[PDB]
């Protein structure tokens, strides 16, 4: 019978297997099973040789069938449990080990392995009993509050569940002229959806800008409703039709400052691909204490709203590049010339360093016409200039930088030959400070800074 030739071939296969010539052995193993279903001890040895050759399935099936037809095949249960362990399956190996151990209690090798694997399983069991999600839960309650619908809708807004219509975003703006507010549930409904979208969106933003599209930029625009009306005089509607970059302090030093971000966040949900809203320094937590916005929100709405706005100020984009040719930035890149947005991106958008430290050194590193790097009196202790900025443009392959933080007695800045560009977009800061504002028109095919002047603001 042919099986006896396969058994002789299995004797040389064990010599060959112990000499790593596995392919010959496995051919002879196939020839043996092609006839014989029942050579249990030598199946378990193809089960072992298969385990060593990572043929998990064959061995597992061979042991299962053998144990099913032979409930006494203890070495097969031991091979099966060893294969299960190697695959990473503990509970199946335990069931097999317990079954080896009850069918033949006299083999201490099976017994010690069973109890070692039980002890290993106690760790994974304890891990499933001790663990939980590694964050404070907090703002997720905003989903619960809305899903509880404490009130649903209001005399002004008509908001949709998500992606509020452009006509309702228009409506919302035109009773910010009337100086009304959103209902708390519907303000939460947009804000949690905005948060979710911002939490998914790229960990730090780099974009190739397209050719025919025309730049609208705001530098700082410390929130005022006339400033919103006046930018709708300065340009048409952002409307997925023009790239619209809000590179500014917006949320501070003006009475209408939560209202500015409430509409602008709406527009970011509806216009995601080329609407980019970058952190001021003044959007950060402590800014709201020093210029009272923390308490101004707390009067306007209960404190949890302000906590959500402070959380969304950590979810907001930190810096970004336009076409790989201009850095759009509140301030300027931190420390030495080698830092890119590809270095900064590795740090996630759920954080703030010290007020003089790496993100804040972005947000507030000041200029100088003085060409070197330097440290500044304002409080960040950092200010950089034309030699260092040209080194960043080469290191990072850019052609110019736009900055937005610096209040002006008039308008914009062109400095050191226009390689660096300043835009400032808050004509009145408060009754301490009224002066001219600048806007820029720039186009995504051809790049040089070109300037628009903005004269006066009412109240």
């Amino acid at each position: 019978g042919a099986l006896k030739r396969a058994e002789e071939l299995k004797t040389q296969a064990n010599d060959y297997f112990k000499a790593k010539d596995y392919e010959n052995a496995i051919k002879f193993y196939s020839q043996a099973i092609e006839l014989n279903p029942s050579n249990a001890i030598y199946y378990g040895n193809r089960s072992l040789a298969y385990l060593r050759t990572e043929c998990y399935g064959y061995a597992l099936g061979d042991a299962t069938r053998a144990i099913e037809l032979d409930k006494k095949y203890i070495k097969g249960y031991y091979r099966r449990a060893a294969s299960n362990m190697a695959l990473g399956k503990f509970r199946a190996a335990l069931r097999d080990y317990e079954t080896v151990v009850k069918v033949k209690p006299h083999d201490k090798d099976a017994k010690m392995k069973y109890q070692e694997c039980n002890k290993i399983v106690k760790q994974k069991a304890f891990e499933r009993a001790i663990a939980g999600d590694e964050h404070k839960r907090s703002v997720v309650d905003s989903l619960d509050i809305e899903s509880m619908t404490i009130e649903d809708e209001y005399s002004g807004p008509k908001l949709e569940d998500g992606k509020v219509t452009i006509s309702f975003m228009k409506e919302l703006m035109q009773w910010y002229k009337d100086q009304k507010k959103l209902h708390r549930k519907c303000a939460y409904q947009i804000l949690v959806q905005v948060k979710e979208v911002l939490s998914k969106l790229s960990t730090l933003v780099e974009t190739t800008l397209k050719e025919t599209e025309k730049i609208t930029v705001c530098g700082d625009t410390h929130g005022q409703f006339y400033d919103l009306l006046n930018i709708f005089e300065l340009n048409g509607l952002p409307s997925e039709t023009n790239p619209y970059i809000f590179n500014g302090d917006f949320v501070d030093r003006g009475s209408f400052s939560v209202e500015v971000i409430l509409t602008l966040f709406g527009f970011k949900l509806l216009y995601p691909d080329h609407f980019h809203l970058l952190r001021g320094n003044a959007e950060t937590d402590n800014m709201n204490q020093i210029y009272g916005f923390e308490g101004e929100v707390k009067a306007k709405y209960t404190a949890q709203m302000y906590e959500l706005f402070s959380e969304v100020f950590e979810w907001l984009p930190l810096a970004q590049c336009i076409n790989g040719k201009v850095l759009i930035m509140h301030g300027g890149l931190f420390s030495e010339d080698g830092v890119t947005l590809d270095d900064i991106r590795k740090i996630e958008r759920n954080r703030q360093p010290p007020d003089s430290g790496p993100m804040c050194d972005l947000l507030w590193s000041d200029p100088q016409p003085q060409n070197g790097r330097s440290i500044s009196k304002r409080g960040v202790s950092c200010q950089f200039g034309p030699d260092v900025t040209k080194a960043f443009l080469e290191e990072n392959n850019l052609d110019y930088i736009i900055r937005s933080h610096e209040v002006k007695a008039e308008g914009y800045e062109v400095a050191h030959g226009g390689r660096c560009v300043t835009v400032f977009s808050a004509p009145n800061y408060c009754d301490q400070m009224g002066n001219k504002a600048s806007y820029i028109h720039l186009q995504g095919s051809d790049l040089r800074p070109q300037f628009h002047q903005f004269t006066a603001v009412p109240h």
């Binding site: 002890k119 106690k122 760790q123 304890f126 001790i130």
Partner: peptide, 27 residues
């Protein structure tokens, strides 16, 4: 969970550690 303090917080903690020694496989 009801707002009642223990008579001896240490022996609760000893009993929790008698459990955590299982949890760490110590003894």
């Amino acid at each position: 969970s009801s707002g009642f303090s223990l008579e001896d917080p240490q022996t609760h903690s000893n009993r929790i550690y008698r459990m955590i020694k299982l949890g760490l496989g110590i003894d």
